[PDB]
Structure formats: structure tokens, C-alpha cells
Amino acid sequence: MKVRASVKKLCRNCKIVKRDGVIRVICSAEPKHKQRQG
């Protein structure tokens, strides 16, 4: 995944989740769009 300081919704299936304090962007279609932090 990416650990960029400005995570955002890249495609339509991307979904924002706050796990354990950290904001993540989990996705179904592309595992690339998986990204942490910020």
C-alpha cells in the first residue's frame, strides 16, 4: 500500500475506514488503491 499523507478516494469502489486511529482507504477492484495514513 501507499502511506501518503493525503489519502483519497481514487476509484468508485474505494472506501475510507478509520482503523486503530489511522485513516485507511480499502478497495475491492484494484488492490493498488489500498492506502494508509493522513
Question: Which of 11, 12, 20, 29 touches RNA (CB under 7 A)?
Answer: 20
| Residues in region 1-38 near Mg ion by CB under 5 A | 1
Tell which residue, 23, 29, 30, 28, has the closest CA to residue 8: 23
- 24, β-bridge pairs: 17, 36
- Give the integer Cα–Cα distance in Å for 14 and 10: 6
Binding of RNA at residue 11 (CB under 7 A)? Answer: no
Positions that interact with RNA (CB under 7 A): 1-3, 5-9, 15-21, 23, 26, 30-32, 34, 38
Applying CB under 5 A, the residues found at the interface with Mg ion are 1
